[PDB]
């Protein structure tokens, strides 16, 4: 019988839960309505940096992830300062719904 051909995950949406440490969430975000897009014409919010061995890294967040929701509140159409505020106010466990195109 013929060899199995492995599957290929092309893209995903996933929810990562970051446990805030004294230093913060261990990420930078970039983007926002009216701002210079992080990617193409997409004015959304993206994870632009992930601190090595910080909380986000341990939670499985990756640079390039598009940040769709913070604790269930959608960031679609948000300005940069609004996304920063959502994240700073998200409490101890921060559920991050992201879109990941690079596997």
């Amino acid at each position: 019988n013929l060899l199995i051909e492995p599957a290929r995950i092309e893209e995903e949406e996933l929810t990562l839960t970051i446990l805030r440490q004294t230093g913060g969430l261990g990420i930078s975000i970039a983007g926002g309505k009216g701002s210079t897009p992080y990617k193409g014409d997409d004015e959304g919010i993206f994870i632009s940096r992930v601190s090595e061995e910080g909380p986000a890294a341990r939670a499985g967040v990756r640079v390039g992830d598009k940040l769709l929701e913070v604790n269930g509140v959608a960031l679609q159409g948000a300005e940069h300062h609004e996304a920063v505020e959502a994240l700073r106010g998200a409490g101890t466990a921060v559920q991050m719904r992201v879109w990941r195109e690079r596997m």
């Binding site: 913060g24 969430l25 990420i27 930078s28 975000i29 970039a30 983007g31 926002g32 009216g34 701002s35 210079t36 992080y38 632009s48 940096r49 940069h80 920063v84 994240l87 700073r88």
Partner: peptide, 8 residues
């Protein structure tokens, strides 16, 4: 306009 990036 600016590229906006913030550590959180």
């Amino acid at each position: 306009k600016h590229f906006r990036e913030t550590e959180v």
